[PDB]
Amino acid sequence: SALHWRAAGAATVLLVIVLLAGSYLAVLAERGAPGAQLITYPRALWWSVETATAVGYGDLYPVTLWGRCVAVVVMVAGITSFGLVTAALATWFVGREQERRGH
């Protein structure tokens, strides 16, 4: 099995895991902080997706240190996995172009 596609799938699974655990840990870290909105699991998961995609709707964000740390982990997981998919596509296209020219 090709390495780039394997790492791509691994980053997909790992990203899903980081999204779910990030929602759970976000709710756990944010409850107890007055004014916090990241306190229900469904919209904590929605916020996890927003964070991993950096879509920037700005409707939900953590206010505590540990919630912000969880947030950073989700950000870096999304940036890393999506950049990994980009790199895998690059490797694929370079292979197909290398065969297209008979080299």
Epitope: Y24, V27, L28, E30, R31, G32, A33, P34, G35, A36, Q37, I39, T40, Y41, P42
Partner: antibody, heavy 118, light 108 residues
């Protein structure tokens, strides 16, 4: 079956303490939170605090004088609220309730009538 | 924290008429409002979740409406068993808070 089992009454002496119990049944999840709500006779509902049994983290209402300490035994599926140094201002019905993680109480216990008197 | 004002505190209606309880929040909270019913010496019973979503086992004459800061619990054709106290619990920001409650009376 009744999902949350609470004792009917507890008699406390002024200055003493009491540990209220809340035994769970039905569907339990790692995402479950158990809340405790205070209702003095004739008054409304007052949120006391919450605990996530699968983790043990508990949060309390900041605006009131902290008299409670929340714990949970995971094997017996039981939530405990320890009220300490009780004044006549603490005589009330104390409910426990379960919350799947949406922020509303789907099921409540029958409530424990706490009377602090000599 | 988020304050929930339930006014009036007492609502008196005739049997069979439509009644509406009001619940106003001190800040915008979307639809994160839930409604409970407590009869005399009873435990609170969830009637409506998320301002308008139905609960299984609750009579269909119970409905909810509103969003932001103004919410309404409505009963079509009030009857004797509807006599109770009604609370509107909020859960948009920590900590969760309750309204002060509205008692429903029936003039028979």
């Amino acid at each position: 079956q009744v999902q949350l089992q609470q004792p009917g009454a507890e008699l406390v002496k002024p200055g003493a303490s009491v540990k209220l119990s809340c035994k769970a049944s039905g569907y339990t999840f790692t995402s479950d939170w158990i809340h405790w709500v205070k209702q003095r006779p004739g008054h409304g509902l007052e949120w006391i605090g919450e605990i996530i049994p699968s983790y043990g983290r508990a949060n309390y209402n900041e605006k009131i004088q902290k008299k409670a300490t929340l714990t949970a035994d995971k094997s017996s599926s039981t939530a405990f609220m320890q009220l300490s140094s009780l004044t006549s201002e603490d005589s009330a019905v104390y409910y426990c309730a379960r919350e799947r993680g949406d922020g509303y109480f789907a099921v409540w216990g029958a409530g424990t009538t706490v009377t602090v008197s000599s | 924290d988020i304050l929930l004002t339930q006014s009036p505190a007492i609502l008196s209606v005739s049997p069979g008429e439509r009644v509406s309880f009001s619940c106003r929040a001190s800040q915008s909270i979307g639809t994160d409002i839930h409604w409970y019913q407590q009869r005399t010496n009873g435990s609170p019973r969830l009637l409506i979740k998320y301002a308008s979503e139905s609960i299984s086992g609750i009579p269909s004459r119970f409905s909810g409406s509103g969003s932001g800061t103004d919410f309404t619990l409505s009963i079509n054709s009030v009857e004797s068993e509807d006599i109770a106290n009604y609370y509107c619990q909020q859960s948009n920001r920590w900590p969760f808070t309750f309204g002060s409650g509205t008692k429903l009376e029936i003039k028979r």
